[model samples]
Target chain A: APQNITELCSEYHNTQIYELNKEIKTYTESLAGYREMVIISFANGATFQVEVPKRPLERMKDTLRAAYFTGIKVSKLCVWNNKTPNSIAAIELS
Target chain B: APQNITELCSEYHNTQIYELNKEIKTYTESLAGEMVIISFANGATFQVEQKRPLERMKDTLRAAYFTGIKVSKLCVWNNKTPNSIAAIELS
Candidate 1:
């Protein structure tokens, strides 16, 4: 569970396409456990380590790609979990 | 496309579960086009409009149900398009 959660920053999908492509590039790794996490960083230098499960993150990854390639009628991605959860370097995506 | 997108509100899954369950109750509608939209209201009086497509939102619906019925490790959900993104919303 997260200790404190807040929106660090947000932007248009066009603005985030580059960072989204860069941050999630290191895929295909094994993060099968909760202890292991992935980094979700923005182009604005705002970064957050989110503990998204492999399936959901991967599933959302497909959606992200679709949003990136095609176009969603609405597309604005927001970065959350600015404060450290449990004084750790990660924020479990909820 | 949204004019200005911002975080209107957010809460833990436990806190928003009721609203999540309630707000999306009016499902099964055919929102095949962008002109048609839906409303997303909170447990409180806070409410906003959303324009999520049938497939993506339905895809997210599965995730939402899984998150509610089972549980996603990350359980916090933030409500977007508070003011209105071109007077619309999505995830």
Candidate 2:
């Protein structure tokens, strides 16, 4: 544990929530890379991508697989990384 | 591009989603022991269990920071068993 791990994580945690617009792109690579990527759009055509690894053992990919293909309404996103809307490096289902 | 990055990236693509409570440990070490805990979201403090992951995080964090892209997200993994972080996504 770092001397200030709780502080560090709290500092970087996804405290900010984003609303989902009508348009989004959840996959870019097709069946080969089905659940690893997404595009989020906001007002004025502002856009961003949230991507995670595709390892069989990783839950991130699996979580997205349902959202992208299984048919569900994406309501909120929990993306961190300095709170930049560029390519947040993350987005949560809850 | 190289010869077939589209092919390569495609070959490595993921195509599934799992339940929210599903737990899978992505970072594995078959060697010695360690602590290196990182806290998250008022839920838990994850024990890193190895030196390399911590080292890897430090290096990866530095690399992403250096890219200074500031608009990046790590292709994250389930880094622990009890804790939901084999993570730390900064760009």
Candidate 3:
């Protein structure tokens, strides 16, 4: 999965598009997408819009996960005392 | 406490006036707030003029949650375990 990540493509949780784009564009020439874009935004003010791709929903889900996974650690730790601690680790490693 | 949300499609944070207007205008109309716009040579900035609807704020919280959760995880892990632990459960 890490290999799947790159400058343009990588996993970032709770990453503001404004923040990321500012960072991402710094390394590259320009962000490439389409005129017909889906403005995907989070409650906190981070947003990114890209033209709908072949798999809009799936890609959206992945993007959602990229965003959602940001707070996972806190949720995981709070729940640790109640059950098995951090099962996703094994899944991730495997 | 997290359910008081509205749908003027509200909320704004570190938002760019130009980019937000472009997206927001599609579904609805009316770029409310002062017409006395502000401009600057060094990245012209403006106040978050309109207040975000409760719902919009909550909704955008989704993005906030998304944007910072990974970092939150790191903080949580570091705080919870000082010695050894690779994984933690989701509660």
The number of the candidate with the highest lDDT is: 2
User: Model 1, range A1-94, lDDT digits (tens) per residue?
Assistant: 1111122122211111112223222222236465444343344454443332133344444433333233221122333333431011111121
Against the true structure, whose DockQ is highest?
1
Per-residue CA lDDT of model 2 for A1-94, tens digit only, reads 2222223233443534455623344343323354434444554564555442123213333334444563433444434544234443233222
Clashing pairs in 1: A93-B74, A94-B74, A94-B75, A94-B76, B3-B86
What is the C-alpha lDDT profile of model 3 across A1-89, one tens digit per residue?
Answer: 12111211223322211122211111101233532223333334433333221332223333334433332221100001112211011
TM-score for candidate 2 (chain B): 0.28
Q: Model 2 chain A: which ten-residue window has the lowest total lDDT?
A: A52-61
* lDDT for predicted candidate 2 compared with the true structure: 0.35
Say which prediction, candidate 1 or candidate 3, comes out ahead on TM-score.
1
DockQ comparisons of all candidates to the true complex: 0.05, 0.03, 0.02
Chain B structural similarity (TM-score) per candidate: 0.22, 0.28, 0.18
Q: At residue B75, what lDDT does model 3 achieve?
A: 8
Per-residue lDDT for B66 in model 1? 25
Instruction: Please name the candidate that would achieve the greatest TM-score relative to the true structure.
Output: 2
Instruction: Put the candidates in lDDT order, highest first.
Output: 2, 1, 3
